[PDB]
Amino acid sequence: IFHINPRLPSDLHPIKVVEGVKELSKKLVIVNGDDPLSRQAQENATLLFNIHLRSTLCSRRMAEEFRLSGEAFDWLLGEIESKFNQAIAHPGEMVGALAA
Amino acid sequence: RHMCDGDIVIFNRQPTLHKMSMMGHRVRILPWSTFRLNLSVTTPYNADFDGDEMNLHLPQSLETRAEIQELAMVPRMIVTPQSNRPVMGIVQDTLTAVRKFTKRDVFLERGEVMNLLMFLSTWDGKVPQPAILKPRPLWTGKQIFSLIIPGHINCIRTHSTHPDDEDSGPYKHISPGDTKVVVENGELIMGILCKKSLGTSAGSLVHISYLEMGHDITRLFYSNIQTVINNWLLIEGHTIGIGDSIADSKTYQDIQNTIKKAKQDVIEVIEKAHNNELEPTPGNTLRQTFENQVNRILNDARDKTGSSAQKSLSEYNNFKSMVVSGAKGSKINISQVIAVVGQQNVEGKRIPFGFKHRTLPHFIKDDYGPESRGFVENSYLAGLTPTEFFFHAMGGREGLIDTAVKTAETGYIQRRLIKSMESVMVKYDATVRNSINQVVQLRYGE
Amino acid sequence: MNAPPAFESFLLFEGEKKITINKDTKVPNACLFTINKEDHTLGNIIKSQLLKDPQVLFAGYKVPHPLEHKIIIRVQTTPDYSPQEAFTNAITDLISELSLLEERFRVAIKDKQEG
Amino acid sequence: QARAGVSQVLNRLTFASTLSHLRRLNSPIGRDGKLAKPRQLHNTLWGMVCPAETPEGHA
Amino acid sequence: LNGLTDRDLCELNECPLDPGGYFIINGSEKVLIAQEKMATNTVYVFAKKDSKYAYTGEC
Amino acid sequence: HIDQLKEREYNNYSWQDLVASGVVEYIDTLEEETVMLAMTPDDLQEKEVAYCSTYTHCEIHPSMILGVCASIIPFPDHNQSPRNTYQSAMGKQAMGVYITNFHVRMDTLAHVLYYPQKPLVTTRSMEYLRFRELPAGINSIVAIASYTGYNQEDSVIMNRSAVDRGFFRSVFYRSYKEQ
Amino acid sequence: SRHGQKGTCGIQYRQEDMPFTCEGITPDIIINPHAIPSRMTIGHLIECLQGKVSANKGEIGDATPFNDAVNVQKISNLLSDYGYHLRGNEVLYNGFTGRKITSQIFIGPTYYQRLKHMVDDKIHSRARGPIQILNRQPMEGRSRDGGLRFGEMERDCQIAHGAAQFLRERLFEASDPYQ
Amino acid sequence: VSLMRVLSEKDVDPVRTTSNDIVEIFTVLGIEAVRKALERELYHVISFDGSYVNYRHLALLCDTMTCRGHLMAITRHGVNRQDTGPLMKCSFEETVDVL
Amino acid sequence: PYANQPTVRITELTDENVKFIIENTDLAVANSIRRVFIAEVPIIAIDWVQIDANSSVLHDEFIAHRLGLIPLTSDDIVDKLQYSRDCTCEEFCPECSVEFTLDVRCNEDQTRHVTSRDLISNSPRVIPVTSRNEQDDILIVKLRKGQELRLRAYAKKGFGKEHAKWNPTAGVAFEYDPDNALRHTVYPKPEEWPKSEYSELDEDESQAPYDPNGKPERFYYNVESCGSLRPETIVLSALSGLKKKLSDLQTQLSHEIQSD
Amino acid sequence: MIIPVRCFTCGKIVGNKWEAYLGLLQAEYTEGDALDALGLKRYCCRRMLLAHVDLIEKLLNYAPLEK
Amino acid sequence: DEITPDLWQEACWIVISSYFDEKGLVRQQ
Amino acid sequence: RVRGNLMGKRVDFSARTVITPDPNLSIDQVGVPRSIAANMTFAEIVTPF
Amino acid sequence: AGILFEDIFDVKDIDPEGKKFDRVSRLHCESESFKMDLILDVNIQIYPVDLGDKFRLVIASTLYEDGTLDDGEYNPTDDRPSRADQFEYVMYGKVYRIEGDETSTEAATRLSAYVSYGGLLMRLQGDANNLHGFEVDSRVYLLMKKLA
RNA sequence: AUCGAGAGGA
Ligand SMILES: [Mg+2]
Ligand SMILES: [Zn+2]
Ligand SMILES: [Zn+2]
């Protein structure tokens, strides 16, 4: 989408990668609430995805391998947020009949 | 009022095994007395046209109409939650033809391209610059298929005949056999398309289309694939006949030599058993070691003769064409038609001595050799000898029995599972609970 | 039961138009001609004569459904020309070709019947 | 209590259906019987009973 | 119909090709289907994996 | 014996005379256990290694293992066996002329084909099944091709102009009774 | 087809729309090639080839099983004497456009059967017909203007859809509404 | 099977050694053990031919079978011994006796 | 931008067939001509039957089906007759139909063959092809002693697109590029394929060298008649009918353009 | 039952050729030579004569209902 | 008077024909 | 009664016939014969639209 | 002028792994001047090539003799002067890969530009200075003419 | 019209 030339140096500061991934993780919510039970259950429900997110979207791979620009990274964060929220189960889903 | 075009109907084939067995369709009125289906939806219905009937239900209110439209229409069913992959895919002639169409050396004249572009429902009306210009303007099949692919989706796949070394030698990105599929920015840059790329497996083009685009765009993708490819196939054609079942004389000689060797190896193992030279391998009775070894020899013979048949086929061979596309058949079916039908089994064992120490009164007693116990050494093109015929009937009868007997047990299991779980639901607190409101899961899945 | 009368493949129903012209809005100088009660016999000759015209940029036809009895012909022209004019000229060329083939066949028959 | 189906209406759809109905043999095992063994093609049917002609349903 | 020629059968409106071998009850053509049974007067020895007898011989 | 059987209509020599001459023997399944069967007289010839040298009986023709409906199948030794079973069912569902005197019969349902043909490709067992005389089908020119896609997943395209000429046309008779 | 290859007629084309050989033969029936490879009904292909020889020569072809005197190579050689390609293929022309088809098509006489299963004996529809005395639900069967059964498996399917209003309609409003 | 005796043998690895009998697991190791073993055994049956089913379906079946603290069979002896109401029970089996 | 100037060369001409080559035309035109021979050349055929007596062993629809297939000599009369849709009469008149009657009773121990000679027409130029002054008459039915067939029939103008009984052909051979120079067909083993009768290759050459510039330009026809029309009248009727279809279309197109 | 009027495949008249075909098989033509004498050059027309079964001759063994 | 392999195929079908001329298909009924 | 007439039952406004292929429908269409469409009905509410 | 790369090539091999396709063949060629290595799939049915043929290869961003961009739409009626008229075989494609020997600390000395002409692939590799005109996802024209 | 039986389709 952003015509990234892999062979040129990027304008994307690695600190924007670190901060952006920290801020994105806070928007991917499966257990709501500020109490420590909610907070722990939220951390657990998203642990493996957050490990995958941090390891895929780390500053070194963004610099050496993916070479994304700032506008492309800003787009990627919004894409991930939108696609995660669309993956959450809808109340009323008859998951037992589906499993059977 | 009478039912009319664009009415929403539930369409159902029994047995109703899963949610894709009842889907919402739009009505189109047609002459003649049958219901008519697009061929991609035959897979989720497990339908075919050998005499099958299906049931139509017309929802009677704007509320049930809206419910069927918003939940159960076929486009929304393209991906199943059972296995996070497409439930419907390109099939039969469209799949064999799309495999042929995307070969590197398919070239289309101007008038043929302008014919094909009448069947893209989503064509922007612009004719792309032909891949070849100066000697004669020619479009490739990949170039016209690229106009079918929706959006700007990106997808890497391998064709079914991709070598296992090619990903590591030279030419990795310039595949000599055209066996690496890259779709990039919505263009099919390279690669032959088969069931690996357009079938129901995860990461196929139809899966990525459904994930990146709507259900509606993917509905148009399936439709445009079928209409374009079926109208090219009126030019290219496809067939099968006797000429696809025949091998060359070298292949037949190598097959006959391999069979003759396997039979001599069984005679050798029989002689070692009779002389008590055969030593039991651990944990097995001598009889079971003898059976294991004879079955090893005859399976190696079937595999080697099948490989010899498979490697003999030209790229024009129509069985090969249907196998590499994945549209129908298998390498074993080719091997049985051309080379060797092989060992017949009952209850996982060679043909029993249903006569006293004999399989048939045509054999001598205690004949443990391959012909006696039901190794069919002929192919279906050579035709079976009478004992091979009767042993192959003994084998096929077991498949007919299993097909008739397995169904009650499995359907009872399906019933009991539904009745155990039917009220288990995701609640608005996102916990999963039963009807007595007990927590089964605090979050669905986990 | 639901057999259509066999004449429905070539007789117009009351008020059915033989030909309708619609502009293709997505590219300039383009039209769809919808022709009722016709088949590949006219579609294929009209399409092929249009492709003989150097001011025609696109010509194609389809039978949308083989149980229906209509064809769609799509034509695009260069902006100095018109798809309606192309379609009219194509039909005139076909009529002239068939008139010449007819006269030449009568001559060939007369020659064959008496040396 | 009596065993059923011993007499049937002669099938007249086609001449082969008539001839075959006159040559039909029944094993009174019971259609619902799940045991495969009496349904298998036993070797001793060679030349006595057709290996191919059996109904592909519960029978 | 026994021993009649094709011409006599045609005069009776019968079909020479009809094999017979069936009955007519209340106008319905009824065929008897052969019933398999275990042969009489023969000693068979059987065993079963889960009963109070090791072997049984039945006649 | 063959030379006497070839004039069976003149010399009244019969199958019964062949059994009375001690040439043919009826053998039961229980006696077959004790019999040694040649599949053909070619098994009786001397060979570079002798499998058996003490045969007691020979088959007349191996195809006699088939029944009525399976005998209609041409080249059944070249098919996967379930497909022979399916033909042995579907051959009983084929329309033909079911009996010659159908015009006097008041069967509740009857299908009669207009133009039955005998098959161009026949087994020799079909002679005795009278299939030559009450056939149930038509020799059709078949192309194996994809064409327009209306034959996919076990469907067929028919020539409408052949159907106009009466190809596979049939008459259906239903009989009603009242008292 | 006698080889367990069954199907319903999908469409009918007139003779001008069917594909044609250079001599003007069109198929009576076109069958799909995907019917063959997993079924392995090679007897069907050999029947077709033998029938093509049979019709050219004017002889009823022998297809008795276990006849070592008949094989595919001998049939192919006989066919080559009548001016056809030895494996039964022919060049077909597309009926709509007249262009030659790139692939040559396997074509020949094959015996076909019309089965008693016809669509006009099976088509059914209901809206507000008669009901049973006891349960007041729709009658059972075509011959009673009956309603189709919406069964427990269909119920479970609509539960898994979450289609609660449609499930209510089919299991109440469309069957036995009462107060 | 005799899991408790084998686990206590001197050179047996007591961490990894396991039965395929789920009632033995439930007796020796308890309800959460049989929750994991039942998932393993169903996964092995479903995946033997290379088929794949999304984990959450297996998880939900195994949780349904184990949420009551004992092995609940997918049979009248399990399903119809829950606290579910009598009309739900009668739609399954034992219809008249339940009522 | 313009029309072809096609050329014709008749190589055989008989009462049964005409063989001819068209050259310097397009494949689409050649195919539409072939299609019109089958579908859109009109002839006269029986299309209405009334049975007064039928004691034969064949049911009435069987007899009527068979009568519809009997070819009637159509040559100069079919251009004069109206279609019954265009005609002004209430049902039938000489301007849109030909009347036929048949009346046969078997009174003898020998089986009476009822044939296209027992059809008697009211118009002397429209008769069964076999009745024209060798080939035998078409068998309609066989009557046993005491069986009778008596019927009246009307024959109507129509063309093979409506029903195959109105198809005048008995086979249309069509071929182009006899030696596969255009490679429209591609043989896996060209040496296996028998030569076309129109081949110009020597017997050591399996197919011509590829022509990258050529296109179909010469077409070989064998048009065989069922006898209702002379073969050359089939061809000339087809050319007139296709030209008429195009002229009718242009009349409607020019009205539609003027309406826009 | 009775010989079709037309060859199903191509529309050639064959309903006038059956009695001639029988009158050539008597006089010892082969079926091939008999079909060739009748001008049945395409195998689709040959199929019609070679595979026909004249069951009407059997139906004529039954006396009619009316004298 | 041995039946040689060239005569065998006609011989055995003469035998089978004689059987069916004698017995027919419903003899057991 | 429970399984036969409550958990499932026969329904009005339903139809059944042989299916056949149609490559020219979209995946979401169904081709319906005219006699079925003439026999089945939908109760459309009358409005000024 | 819109030309990206021009050189004269000698056909060193044809289909060395064997004939993978019937109408298309893979040339292996070497430059005389810039010492480039070329792999090229060619429609040899319409433009046959023989072992040891010599040809001139131009890669261009546009066919127009004046610098003018291409919209990639087939207009056969465009009468502008076009360099295609100096050549015999012309293809249109896009650059899909540029590989090189670059390291973490050094730029590439050698480059390898990959182009797909509707699935007819090309790899042109050699000294990086000759390939700086190639950019991934750029459309390019191949123009080829045999030399006597 | 019901009940029972049998034969079939996917
Ligand atoms: Mg089916
Ligand atoms: Zn009139
Ligand atoms: Zn013919």
Tab-separated table of C-alpha atoms in Angstrom, chain J residues 34-66:
chain	number	residue	atom	x	y	z
J	34	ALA	CA	-25.752	-54.893	-46.182
J	35	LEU	CA	-25.404	-51.538	-44.399
J	36	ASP	CA	-22.999	-50.319	-47.096
J	37	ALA	CA	-25.439	-51.359	-49.823
J	38	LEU	CA	-28.047	-49.251	-48.014
J	39	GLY	CA	-25.732	-46.218	-48.034
J	40	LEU	CA	-25.440	-46.077	-44.227
J	41	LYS	CA	-21.944	-44.626	-44.195
J	42	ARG	CA	-21.925	-42.991	-40.727
J	43	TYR	CA	-21.667	-45.293	-37.723
J	44	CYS	CA	-24.528	-43.411	-36.062
J	45	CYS	CA	-26.873	-44.589	-38.838
J	46	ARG	CA	-25.408	-48.100	-38.906
J	47	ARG	CA	-26.032	-48.309	-35.146
J	48	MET	CA	-29.739	-47.818	-35.880
J	49	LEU	CA	-30.138	-50.819	-38.192
J	50	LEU	CA	-27.569	-53.112	-36.578
J	51	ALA	CA	-29.033	-52.674	-33.066
J	52	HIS	CA	-32.763	-52.643	-33.922
J	53	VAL	CA	-35.172	-55.178	-32.379
J	54	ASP	CA	-38.424	-55.615	-34.345
J	55	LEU	CA	-40.735	-56.408	-31.397
J	56	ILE	CA	-43.818	-55.309	-33.379
J	57	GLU	CA	-43.634	-58.702	-35.111
J	58	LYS	CA	-44.226	-60.292	-31.698
J	59	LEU	CA	-46.997	-57.847	-30.796
J	60	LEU	CA	-48.763	-58.944	-33.992
J	61	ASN	CA	-49.035	-62.502	-32.613
J	62	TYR	CA	-51.853	-61.307	-30.334
J	63	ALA	CA	-55.334	-61.212	-31.812
J	64	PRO	CA	-57.025	-57.800	-31.830
J	65	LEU	CA	-59.842	-56.971	-29.456
J	66	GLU	CA	-62.238	-56.190	-32.326
